[PDB]
RNA sequence: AACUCAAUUUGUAAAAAAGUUUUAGAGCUAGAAAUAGCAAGUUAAAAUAAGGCUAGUCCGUUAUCAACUUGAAAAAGUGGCACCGAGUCGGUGCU
DNA sequence: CAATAATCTTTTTTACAAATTGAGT
DNA sequence: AAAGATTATTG
C-alpha cells in the first residue's frame, strides 16, 4: 500500500512514492542494452524537467505575415498583367528587368539597368527624380504624356505600400486650408444661431488645430480662445469631431440615448442620419462643415511639412523633406569643414560610428544619429537653426521611415487616381482599367471571411458561391461574404452543455427572455385573508401577468403586481408576495426594444413571427459590420417601413447564452409531451422550474441529457497556459508509469500541487491626459526606470498620496511606504492591483482591516478620478472603498485565510478530475462510483510553511532535487491532513465565525510539539497524534520527522530531463551580407551566399550517429569515422525521406545504416567516474550531474543568507556556531567540480575569490557561495559572480568524447533504463 | 447554479510602417602602385523562412516525441519481492 | 586544440470567440 | 527577454 505525491510546474514535474509510514521505497530495476549491467537500485522519488511549452502566438504572427507578403506580391502581379500587352510595345523586357533586379550582372539575363535598359537614360532619370516622390508629384501635376514605364513605377509604388485602412470614407482633396474651412464652420454655425454668434476674430485656427499636440489639448486650446463656449458645448463637440475625437451630442440637443459620432467609423453616415432625423436637416450643413475641417486637419496631421497646394500633398511634402535634407547637409558639411576638420572623416565617412555616414550607409537609427550629432551641433556657431530642426525630428530626414505608419490609404488613392486621370487620354487601356487599378489598392479581404482557401486550410471557413478564382473584382460575386461572415463566429461559439449538438441562442433571444421571466414567475407565492395556505401562480395567472405587466413595462415592480394584477383584475384589496422582493429581475428587454422600433404590438405578440424576430436578433448579434447587417435584414424590407428598417440596422446585441432552442422549447416529456417552457408556463400545483425539471426523475429530461454524449486531445482543450498543459500531460504519464512500477496496484491517494516597461508607459501616458496633469512635463521619465515599484506608483498616483489629500515629493520615495490595500495577513497579493504608495502606512487606519471609513469619505472622489482614467482597476477601487460597504467582516477575514489552504483554481480541479477518472473506473450496484483512489489537492503554502516550520529549508540554486522533495512532502502533508481531519475531505478530496478563523489558522498545529498562541499560553499536544473517531496513528513526532529528515538527504533522486526534438524557425532570421564561408545558407536555391548573402546559425532538430568512411587524402582512401552529425530543422525531411542518400551527399561512404542512432536534444551520456553529459546539439554539451549536497549545509546556507519570533536566537545561534561550514562547502563544490565539471581554470578563480573574501561578513559570504552552484548546476554552463568577480563560462565545445561513452535511454521516471555502450559500435 | 461590471489568459482573422540582403542610381582628380585629397549620400526594384502539392490570392516556426516489439497514425504492449544500509545507489536473503 | 568575445527581427491597428478570476450583487 | 548555441577570431 502506497501513495503518490506530485508537484506540477511549468518547467518541472516532481514525483514521489510513499508508504503508510511516510517512507520512500526502493527497488532494483532491470537494465537493458549491451552493457554488463543488468540491474540497478533506485529510490521511488524523482523529478522530470522540460523546456517550457510555447503559445501559438509567434507561430500565428509569422503565418499572418506570410499571407500579407503573398497578397502584396499579387497586387503587383495584377497591376503587371494589366500593363502587360501595352507595355510589350514599349519594352518587351521591362518587367523581366524588374524581376531580375536582385541578381548580379554575372547572373542577369537582361541589361543591368532596370527602368530603361541603357545607362545614359537611366542616369538622367535619377537626376531629374532623386526620389520616387519627385516622379509621383510630376505624374500628378504635368499634362504632357508620360513614359508608360514611369507611370507603372509610381502606380506600383502606391500599390506596394498602400497605407492603412483605419479611416473609413473618402477624403476630399480640396479640403486643405484649416483656416479657411474653420471660418466656414463658424459662418455655417452663426447662420443657425444668429442670436448667439461666435467671434472667431483673431483666432489662429491653423496654429491651434494643426499643432503637434494631442487632439484633446488642441480642442482645449481652441475653446480657450472663445469666451462663452463650453468644452462640451455644440461648437466644442463639432471641433471635437473635426479633430478626430468621438463626442456625444445628447446634452447638446436634449435627447434620450447617447448619440456619439466619429467621422472615421463605418457608422458615421448612418449615425448622422439618425441624429438629423431627430433634430432636423437644418443641421445638415453644420455637420458637413465639420467633416470638411476633419479632412484638412487630417492632412496637417499627416505631413511633416506644409505645402503650397497640389493634388499630391504627400509626395510634395517628401520633396520638401529631401530638399530640406539637401540644403541642411550642404550647410552642415561646409559648416564642419570650417569649424571642425578633426571630425569630418569620422562624421561623413566612418560607418562604424553614428555620424551621417552610419546614418545612411551604416545601421544607425535616426535617434542614434541625433544622439550622436547633437553635442557636435552645440559646439559650433551658425547652428541654432538646425538644432530646432533636430528637436522637432526634422533634421536630415529620410522619406521611408517608421513614422509613415500613419499615412491612410486614401492619400495614396488620391495620387493614383490623379495620375490615371492625366494619362488615360494618351493611353486608352488606362481609361478602361481606371476602376480596376483603383480596386487593387483599396480592396481588403474582410477579417470575417479569412483565408480565401479551397478546402486545404485548417484555418479557413469561407464559402464560395461561385467556383472561379477569386480576384479583387469578382470578390463579392464569388465569395458569400455573409455565410462566411456567419461561419466566422459560429466556429468559436459554444453549444448547449445539456444538448451538446445544439447551438446556444443569442443572449437577447426573445425565447431566452421569455424562459427567464417564467422561470422566475413560476416560483412566486401569494396569500391573503381567506386562504389556508400560500399559493403559486397558476398557468392562467402567469400568462395573465406576462401579457398585462411584462409586455408593457421593461421592469415589473412588486408594487404593480399587487396593484395592477392583484387589485384591478383579482379584486385583492391587499395581498402578500414572496419569491420576488422589490422588483423582478428578468425582463423582456428585447421585446420592448423591437416594439419601440417597428411599432406594431400585434406583429410582436402574434406567435407567427416568432422565428422572424429571433432571426432579427441573431443577425444583430451575429454581425458587427454595417454592410453585413443591412444585406441580411433586407429580407424583411417588404415587411417593415423604410424608416423602420433604418433604425433596425443600427441596433446591436452582444452576447451568447448557454441554452439552445431545442432545450427550452423543444424536447418533450414523453409522458406529458410538454416542453420545459411549457412546464414553466403551467405545472399543476407543483410549479417546478428549470433546475428541478432537468433533475426530476419523474420526468424524462434527465435521461435524454446524459444520453449525450483521446488524452492529449482532452488536455489541449482545457483553459490555461500551454506551459501548464505541458506539465499536466507529463504529470499523467508519470502516474501511469509509477503504477506499472508498483505492479499495477493503484495507489491509495494522489496528492497534487500546482505552482502559481513598454506596457507601463502607455498606461501612465493614457492616464495623465484624462486628468491633464503637467506632471511629466514637471517630472520627465524613462520606460526602463518604471520597474521600480515605488516610482511606478508615484505616476499611477499622479504624484499624490492615496490616503491623504496631500501630494508626494518625488525625491523622497525611500521614506514613503507601500501599503497592502487588503493586508497580506489575509491574502498575499504583492501586485499593483493591491498596493498603494503613501507617505505613512499609518494613515490607512487600523492595520488589521481595509482603509478606514474616514479615509474613504475623504479620498473616494480622488479614487474615482483615478478609475475614470484607468490608472487603478475596478478591483482596486472596490477594495479601496469596502469600508463604507461593511469593510472586512470577521467572516470575510475567515474566507481569505481559508483560501490560503484550499485550491480554488479551476485548472487544478480539472487535473484532479482526469486522475480521479483514470484511477477510479469500476461502478457499483446502484450505478455509483467506486472510489479506490482519493485525489488530494493542496496549495504551495502548506509545504513551504512546513519546511520553514520544521527546518527542512529549500535552496533552489543547489540542484533540482527540491522539485522531487516538494512532491514527497506533499504526499506526506496531504495524507496526514486527511488522516487527522477526515471530515475535511469535502474541501481537499475530489468527489461563531471565529471558529473557522482560528481553525484554518491553527490548521497545521498538530505537527508542532509545543504551541504558543499569541494570547499568552503554552499548550503541548502529545508526542503521537491520533484520530478521534479513527484509531489509526497519524504522526509520531519522534520517528516521522526523522523519517522525513532521512528521505530529504538520500543522495539518489531520479532527475530526468525530457528529451525533445527541436522545432521552429530554420535559423537566426538575420540576413547577413556576402562573405566566403560554408556556413551561410541560401535564401533561394539559385542565390549563392558568396554572391548574395544569406542566413546563418541553423537550429539542429536532432543529431545522429554516423559510423561510416570518408575519402581521406588525394588517394581517396577511406578512413573510418564515428562522428556526430547535426540534422537541421530545414534539413530534416530530406534526411528522414532517404537517410542513406542524404548522408552520401555529404561525403559519407559505406554508412552502417543499422547503427544510425537518432539523438535528440538532452540525450544522456555517462562516462568515467559517473560523469554525465547531455547533448545540446551536434557539437555542444551540457552538464549532466546533480550535486547531492548534505542537508546540513543547505539549511546553514538558507539561514546564513536569511539573516532577517524569539526562536531566532535558536536560528542565529547556528550560523556563528557553525561558521566552519563555509570551507567545507567550498570543497564539497570543489570535490564535485574536479570529478564531473572539469573546469580547472575557473575552479581556481572560485577558490582564489572565496579565499580573498573570507574576511567578509558571514552573510555576504553565504549568499555569494550560493552563486557558485551555477558552476555545478545541471544543464548549460552560465556565467556567475562571486562578490564582484565575474567568472565566465567553461563550455563543453566538443562531442567527440561521448561517442565512446554510454548512452542512457531514460523512462519518464528514470526508473526504467536502456544503456548502450557506444564503444561497441565500429 | 444565475446576473452585472472589470480585468486576465488563450485562440483566430484582416491590415499598415520599418529592418535586412543583392542589384541600379557612370564618382572625379592626381599617383606605376598601395595611397591621398575632393565630390556625393535621403531613392527604387526584388526577396522576406528553403520551399511544398493539394495548385488555393492555399500551406510551411504551436501542441505531441526515452528505448525495444507491434502499428499508417493515434496509441498499445515490454522490466519479481523483502529486508539491512547510503556520495548519485550499494549489499544480503527468497521464487 | 582552448579561451575569448559578439550576436541574436521590430512596431502598430482593426475585428471576433472562449475560460477564468475577483469584486459587487 | 533573456538563455545559450553558433560563429568567428585569437592564443
UniProtKB/Swiss-Prot annotation:
Annotated consequence of substituting residue 67 to A: No DNA cleavage
Positions bound to Mn(2+) 1: 7, 753
Keyword terms, alphabetized: Antiviral defense, DNA-binding, Endonuclease, Exonuclease, Hydrolase, Magnesium, Manganese, Metal-binding, Nuclease, RNA-binding
Region (RuvC-I): 1-59
Annotated region described as RuvC-II, given as residue ranges: 710-756
Family to which the UniProt record says this protein belongs: Belongs to the CRISPR-associated protein Cas9 family. Subtype II-A subfamily.
The protein, known as: CRISPR-associated endonuclease Cas9/Csn1
Gene behind the chain: cas9
Amino acid at each position: 500500500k502506497y501513495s503518490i505525491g506530485l508537484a506540477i510546474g511549468t518547467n518541472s514535474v516532481g514525483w514521489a512514492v510513499i508508504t503508510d509510514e511516510y517512507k520512500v521505497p526502493s527497488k532494483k530495476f532491470k537494465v537493458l542494452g549491451n552493457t554488463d549491467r543488468h540491474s540497478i537500485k533506485k529510490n521511488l522519488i524523482g523529478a522530470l524537467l522540460f523546456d517550457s511549452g510555447e503559445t501559438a502566438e509567434a507561430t500565428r504572427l509569422k503565418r499572418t505575415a506570410r499571407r500579407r507578403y503573398t497578397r502584396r506580391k499579387n497586387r503587383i502581379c495584377y497591376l503587371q498583367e494589366i500593363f502587360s500587352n501595352e507595355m510589350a510595345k514599349v519594352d518587351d523586357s521591362f518587367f523581366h528587368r524588374l524581376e531580375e533586379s536582385f541578381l548580379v550582372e554575372e547572373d542577369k539575363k537582361h541589361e543591368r539597368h532596370p527602368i530603361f535598359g541603357n545607362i545614359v537614360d537611366e542616369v538622367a532619370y535619377h537626376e531629374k527624380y532623386p526620389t520616387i516622390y519627385h516622379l509621383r508629384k510630376k505624374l500628378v501635376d504635368s499634362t504632357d504624356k508620360a513614359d508608360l514605364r514611369l507611370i507603372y513605377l509610381a502606380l506600383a509604388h502606391m500599390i506596394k505600400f498602400r497605407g492603412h485602412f483605419l479611416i473609413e470614407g473618402d477624403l476630399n482633396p480640396d479640403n486643405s486650408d484649416v483656416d479657411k474651412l474653420f471660418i466656414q464652420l463658424v459662418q455655417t454655425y452663426n447662420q443657425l444661431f444668429e442670436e448667439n454668434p461666435i467671434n472667431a476674430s483673431g483666432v489662429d485656427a491653423k496654429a491651434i488645430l494643426s499643432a503637434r499636440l494631442s487632439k484633446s489639448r488642441r480642442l482645449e486650446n481652441l475653446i480657450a480662445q472663445l469666451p462663452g463656449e463650453k468644452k462640451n458645448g455644440l461648437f466644442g463637440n463639432l471641433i471635437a469631431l473635426s479633430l478626430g475625437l468621438t463626442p456625444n451630442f445628447k446634452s447638446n440637443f436634449d435627447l434620450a440615448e447617447d448619440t456619439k459620432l466619429q467621422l472615421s467609423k463605418d457608422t458615421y453616415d448612418d449615425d448622422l442620419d439618425n441624429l438629423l432625423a431627430q433634430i432636423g436637416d437644418q443641421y445638415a450643413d453644420l455637420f458637413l462643415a465639420a467633416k470638411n475641417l476633419s479632412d484638412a486637419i487630417l492632412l496637417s496631421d499627416i505631413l511633416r511639412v506644409n505645402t503650397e497646394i497640389t493634388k499630391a500633398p504627400l509626395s510634395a511634402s517628401m520633396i520638401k523633406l529631401y530638399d530640406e535634407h539637401h540644403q541642411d547637409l550642404t550647410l552642415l558639411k561646409a559648416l564642419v569643414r570650417q569649424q571642425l576638420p578633426e571630425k569630418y572623416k569620422e562624421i561623413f565617412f566612418d560607418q562604424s560610428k553614428n555620424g551621417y555616414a552610419g546614418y545612411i550607409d551604416g545601421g544607425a537609427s535616426q535617434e542614434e544619429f541625433y544622439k550622436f550629432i547633437k553635442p557636435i551641433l552645440e559646439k559650433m556657431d551658425g547652428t541654432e537653426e538646425l538644432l530646432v530642426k533636430l528637436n522637432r525630428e526634422d533634421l536630415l530626414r529620410k522619406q521611408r521611415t517608421f513614422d509613415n505608419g500613419i499615412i491612410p490609404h486614401q492619400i495614396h488613392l488620391g495620387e493614383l487616381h490623379a495620375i490615371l486621370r492625366r494619362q488615360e487620354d494618351f493611353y486608352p487601356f488606362l481609361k478602361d482599367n481606371r476602376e480596376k487599378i483603383e480596386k487593387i489598392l483599396t480592396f481588403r479581404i474582410p477579417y470575417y471571411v479569412g483565408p480565401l482557401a479551397r478546402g486545404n486550410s485548417r484555418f479557413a471557413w469561407m464559402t464560395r458561391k461561385s467556383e472561379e478564382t477569386i480576384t479583387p473584382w469578382n470578390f463579392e460575386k464569388v465569395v458569400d461574404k455573409g455565410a462566411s461572415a456567419q461561419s466566422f463566429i459560429e466556429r468559436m461559439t459554444n453549444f448547449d452543455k445539456n444538448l451538446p449538438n445544439e447551438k446556444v441562442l443569442p443572449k437577447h433571444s426573445l425565447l431566452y427572455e421569455y424562459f427567464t421571466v417564467y422561470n422566475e414567475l413560476t416560483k412566486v407565492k401569494y396569500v391573503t385573508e381567506g386562504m389556508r395556505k400560500p399559493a403559486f401562480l397558476s398557468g392562467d395567472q402567469k400568462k395573465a401577468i406576462v401579457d398585462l405587466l411584462f409586455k408593457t413595462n421593461r421592469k415589473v415592480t412588486v408594487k404593480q403586481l399587487k396593484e395592477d394584477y392583484f387589485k384591478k383584475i383579482e379584486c385583492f384589496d391587499s395581498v402578500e408576495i414572496s419569491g420576488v422582493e422589490d422588483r423582478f429581475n428578468a425582463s423582456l428587454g428585447t421585446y420592448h426594444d423591437l416594439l419601440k422600433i417597428i411599432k406594431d404590438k400585434d406583429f410582436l405578440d402574434n406567435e407567427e413571427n416568432e422565428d422572424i424576430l429571433e432571426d432579427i436578433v441573431l443577425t444583430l448579434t451575429l454581425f458587427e459590420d454595417r454592410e453585413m447587417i443591412e444585406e441580411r435584414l433586407k429580407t424583411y424590407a417588404h415587411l417593415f417601413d423604410d424608416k423602420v428598417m433604418k433604425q433596425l440596422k443600427r441596433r446591436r446585441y452582444t452576447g451568447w447564452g448557454r441554452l439552445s432552442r431545442k432545450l427550452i422549447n423543444g424536447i418533450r416529456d414523453k409522458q406529458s409531451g410538454k416542453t420545459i417552457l411549457d412546464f414553466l408556463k403551467s405545472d399543476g400545483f407543483a410549479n417546478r422550474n428549470f433546475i428541478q425539471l432537468i433533475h426530476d426523475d419523474s420526468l424524462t429530461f434527465k435521461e435524454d441529457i446524459q444520453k449525450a454524449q483521446s488524452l492529449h486531445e482532452h488536455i489541449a482543450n482545457l483553459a490555461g497556459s500551454p506551459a501548464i498543459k505541458k506539465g499536466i500531460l507529463q504529470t499523467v504519464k508519470v502516474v501511469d508509469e509509477l503504477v506499472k512500477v508498483m505492479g499495477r496496484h493503484k495507489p491509495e491517494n494522489i496528492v497534487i500541487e500546482m505552482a502559481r516597461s513598454r506596457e507601463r508607459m502607455k498606461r501612465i501616458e493614457e492616464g495623465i491626459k484624462e486628468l491633464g496633469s503637467q506632471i511629466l512635463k514637471e517630472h520627465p521619465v524613462e520606460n526602463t526606470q518604471l520597474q521600480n515599484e515605488k516610482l511606478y506608483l508615484y505616476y499611477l498616483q499622479n504624484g499624490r498620496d492615496m490616503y491623504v489629500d496631500q501630494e508626494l515629493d518625488i525625491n523622497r520615495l525611500s521614506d514613503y511606504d507601500v501599503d497592502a490595500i487588503v493586508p497580506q495577513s489575509f491574502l498575499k497579493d504583492d501586485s499593483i492591483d493591491n498596493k498603494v504608495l503613501t507617505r505613512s502606512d499609518k494613515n490607512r487606519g487600523k492595520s488589521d482591516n481595509v482603509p478606514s471609513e474616514e479615509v474613504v469619505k475623504k479620498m473616494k472622489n480622488y479614487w474615482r478620478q483615478l478609475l475614470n482614467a484607468k490608472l487603478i482597476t475596478q478591483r482596486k477601487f472596490d477594495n479601496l472603498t469596502k469600508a463604507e460597504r461593511g469593510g472586512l467582516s470577521e467572516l470575510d477575514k475567515a474566507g481569505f485565510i481559508k483560501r490560503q489552504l484550499v485550491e480554488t483554481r479551476q485548472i487544478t480541479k480539472h487535473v484532479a478530475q482526469i486522475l480521479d477518472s483514470r484511477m477510479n473506473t469500476k461502478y457499483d450496484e446502484n450505478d455509483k462510483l467506486i472510489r479506490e483512489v482519493k485525489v488530494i489537492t493542496l496549495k504551495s503554502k502548506l509545504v513551504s510553511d512546513f519546511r520553514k516550520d520544521f527546518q527542512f529549508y529549500k535552496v533552489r540554486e543547489i540542484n533540482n532535487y527540491h522539485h522531487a522533495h516538494d512532491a514527497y512532502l506533499n504526499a506526506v502533508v496531504g495524507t496526514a491532513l486527511i488522516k487527522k481531519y477526515p471530515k475535511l475531505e469535502s474541501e481537499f478530496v475530489y468527489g461563531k465565525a471565529t471558529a473557522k478563523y482560528f481553525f484554518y489558522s491553527n490548521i497545521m498545529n498538530f505537527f508542532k510539539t509545543e504551541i504558543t498562541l499569541a494570547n499568552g499560553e503554552i499548550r503541548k499536544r502529545p508526542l503521537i497524534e491520533t484520530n478521534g473517531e479513527t484509531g489509526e496513528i497519524v504522526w509520531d513526532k519522534g520517528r516521522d520527522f526523522a523519517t522525513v529528515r532521512k528521505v530529504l538527504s538520500m543522495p539518489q533522486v531520479n532527475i530526468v530531463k525530457k528529451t525533445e526534438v527541436q522545432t521552429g524557425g530554420f535559423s537566426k532570421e538575420s540576413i547577413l551580407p556576402k562573405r566566403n564561408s560554408d556556413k551561410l545558407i541560401a535564401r533561394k536555391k539559385d542565390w549563392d551566399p558568396k554572391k548574395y548573402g544569406g542566413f546563418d546559425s541553423p537550429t539542429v532538430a536532432y543529431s545522429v550517429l554516423v559510423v561510416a568512411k570518408v575519402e581521406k587524402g588525394k588517394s581517396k582512401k577511406l578512413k573510418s569515422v564515428k562522428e556526430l552529425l547535426g540534422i537541421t530543422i530545414m534539413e530534416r525531411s530530406s534526411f528522414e525521406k532517404n537517410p542513406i542518400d542524404f548522408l552520401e551527399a555529404k561525403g559519407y561512404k559505406e554508412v552502417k545504416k543499422d547503427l544510425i542512432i537518432k539523438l535528440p536534444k538532452y540525450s544522456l551520456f555517462e562516462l568515467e567516474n559517473g560523469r554525465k553529459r547531455m547533448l545540446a546539439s551536434a557539437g555542444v554539451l551540457q552538464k549532466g550531474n546533480e550535486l547531492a549536497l548534505p542537508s546540513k549545509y543547505v539549511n546553514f546556507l538558507y539561514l546564513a543568507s536569511h539573516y532577517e519570533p524569539e526562536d531566532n536566537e535558536q536560528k542565529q545561534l547556528f550560523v556563528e556556531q557553525h561558521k566552519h561550514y563555509l570551507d567545507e562547502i567550498i570543497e564539497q563544490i570543489s570535490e564535485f567540480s574536479k570529478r564531473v565539471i572539469l573546469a580547472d581554470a575557473n575552479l581556481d578563480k572560485v577558490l582564489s575569490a572565496y579565499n580573498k573574501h573570507r574576511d567578509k561578513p558571514i552573510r555576504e559570504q553565504a549568499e555569494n557561495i550560493i552563486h557558485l552552484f551555477t558552476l555545478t548546476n545541471l544543464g548549460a554552463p552560465a556565467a556567475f559572480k562571486y562578490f564582484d568577480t565575474t567568472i565566465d563560462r567553461k563550455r563543453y565545445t566538443s562531442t567527440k568524447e561521448v561517442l565512446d561513452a554510454t548512452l542512457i535511454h531514460q523512462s519518464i521516471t528514470g526508473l526504467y533504463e536502456t544503456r548502450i555502450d557506444l564503444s561497441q559500435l565500429g
